[PDB]
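Interim report to the steering committee. The following record documents the input for Ribonuclease HI (155 residues).
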Amino acid sequence: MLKQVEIFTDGSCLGNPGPGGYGAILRYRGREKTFSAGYTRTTNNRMALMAAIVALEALKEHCEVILSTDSQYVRQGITQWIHNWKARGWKTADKKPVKNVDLWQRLDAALGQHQIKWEWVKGHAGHPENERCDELARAAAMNPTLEDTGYQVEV
Ligand SMILES: [Mn+2]
């Protein structure tokens, strides 16, 4: 046994690409930490990844994380793509670089640092914390202050 800890994440974007933001909550024995930031030009998908990355990298020790998210991108990625990417060296079946590789690798590095337990939020049947993350992301998307320099503009 290590350390329980619960993490709720959410990403949001006003366009594609466009101003976006992420929301994330880190909870440990009642204690709760909040993460949030907005970017001038990004995508929903990158914001979903960021949320998870920020919360995870905030852990100063190996934990038993319960990562809750309603992002269809992260799910379909963790349960459909991730495994293959590691086998082909982060390249598409066509020997082509994968999209958002910068955040996917960052996410995977932080993941193996703990014992992750994914909880996919279905028909918005999420907890208040997931709603809170949604609010933080939307608020941040409407008030962008940084740039997502990792995003390769597809205009
Ligand atoms: Mn949302």
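The pocket of manganese (II) ion is lined by residues 10, 12, 70, 134 (CB under 6 Å). The committee is asked to note this result when reviewing the revised timeline.
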